[PDB]
Design a protein around this ligand. Structure first.
Ligand code: HEM
Length: 383
């Protein structure tokens, strides 16, 4: 029974949710299941969402649990920590995402794209864009980013894809363990020998600052996140271009619109519809409502990034979106995400000027964004 902040008509929010938004910025709405020991709050007002995420000190990211020390600790997963642990751990990883270090990666990303678009083009049209382009590209990039040996990348990417979208649970569980197990070896092997990866730079700069188990969970986490998020962001960006062919040719010619378009696909997709629920540590007054210590708030990225009447417009100037969230948890991988879109969208458009949907729009299936990211299951294309 999908909550209102995760319901969509295709890519757009639903009329009932946009109607709820009109009543105010804050709502008595149960988004999370379980409870009702704790009061539920749904946050829809833009300023109010910004304010909660910036106020980590009174709003924690840790999971609301009956007793502490009866929660899964989740080593290496940045969005599950609070300061100071998080302040500590964020500082550890941050170097790997420097503007400098990304620029080094740019050429290998360019290559990965061309190589994947050749394989995509290799199969005759129609081709599913989700399986032969949207998954492999970020998957491979995630492996190069992790310093995964070339001859392993193929297999490891299969497991990443399969652990996230297989119809069968056992297969999901199997591929799931393969990645945990592969990541452990690689992390300890990189402790011995710090190399090209992001595991390498973390050891060479903040080796002692991080425990072995916090490397392994981080590495795995960053690997899966990088892949699945970008698979969804890319597929949706392409779907949006393909169903606005003028907008496409407009970026085709005039390549400099890429940054502007990059923001617009982030805003419009908003593949992350809500960030981790926030838990009140103190009593707080906000927007005429009293929030008590127990209460759990769901921030709606969908309420903030979207409005009734939205048009996909890559020429939008004032993207004030929070697709990457806000505050200390603000996506640490945003520079990689933006780099990928900036490399990838020009390449597809510049290669397939007549890139076209091969089935009717109504035949498209969408993965709900309530678990993980919002996505298209399949994107059949011809050119
Ligand atoms: C592609 C589009 C992406 C979107 C829309 C997105 C969205 C987000 C959001 C909204 C958060 C905040 C979570 C919260 O406050 O509860 C977040 C955090 C995070 N993201 Fe992303 N992300 C994207 C890509 C990526 C990529 C490629 C990576 C890997 C490099 C990544 C790694 C992370 C990590 C490690 C965090 C936790 C950071 C922290 O808690 O301080 N994301 N992301």
């Amino acid at each position: 029974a999908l909550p209102l902040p995760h319901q969509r008509l295709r890519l757009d929010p639903v009329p009932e949710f946009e109607e709820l938004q009109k009543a105010g910025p804050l709502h008595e709405y149960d988004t999370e299941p379980g409870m009702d020991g704790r009061k539920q709050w749904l946050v829809t007002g833009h300023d109010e969402v910004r304010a909660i995420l910036a106020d980590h000190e009174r709003f924690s990211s840790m999971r609301p649990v009956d007793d502490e020390a009866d929660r899964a600790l989740l080593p290496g997963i940045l969005q599950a920590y609070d300061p100071p642990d998080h302040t500590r751990l964020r500082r550890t990883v941050a170097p790997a995402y420097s503007a400098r270090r990304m620029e080094r990666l740019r050429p290998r990303i360019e290559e990965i794209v061309e190589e994947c678009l050749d394989d995509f083009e290799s199969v005759g049209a129609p081709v599913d864009f989700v399986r032969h382009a949207a998954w492999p590209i970020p998957a491979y990039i995630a492996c190069e980013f992790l310093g995964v040996p070339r001859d392993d990348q193929a297999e490891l990417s299969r497991m990443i894809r399969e652990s996230r979208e297989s119809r069968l649970p056992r297969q999901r569980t199997l591929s799931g363990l393969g990645i945990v197990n592969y990541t452990k070896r690689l992390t300890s092997g990189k402790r011995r020998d710090p190399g090209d990866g992001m595991i390498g730079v973390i050891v060479r700069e903040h080796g002692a600052e991080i425990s072995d188990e916090e490397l392994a969970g981080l590495a795995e986490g960053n690997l899966i996140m990088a892949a699945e998020q970008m698979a969804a962001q890319l597929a949706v960006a392409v779907l949006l271009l393909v169903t606005h062919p003028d907008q496409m040719a407009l970026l085709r010619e005039k390549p400099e619109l890429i940054d502007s378009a990059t923001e617009e696909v982030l805003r419009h997709a908003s593949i992350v519809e809500a960030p981790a629920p926030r838990v009140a540590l103190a009593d707080v007054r906000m927007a005429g409502r009293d929030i008590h210590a127990g209460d759990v708030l769901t921030c709606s990225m969908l309420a903030t990034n979207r409005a009734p009447g939205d048009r996909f417009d890559i020429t939008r100037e004032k993207a004030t979106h929070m697709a990457f969230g806000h505050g200390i948890h603000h996506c640490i991988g945003a520079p990689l995400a933006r780099l990928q879109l900036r490399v990838a969208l020009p390449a597809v458009v510049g290669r397939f000027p007549s890139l076209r949907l091969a089935v009717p729009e109504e035949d498209l299936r969408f993965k709900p964004g309530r678990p993980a990211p919002f996505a298209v299951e399949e994107l059949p294309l011809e050119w």
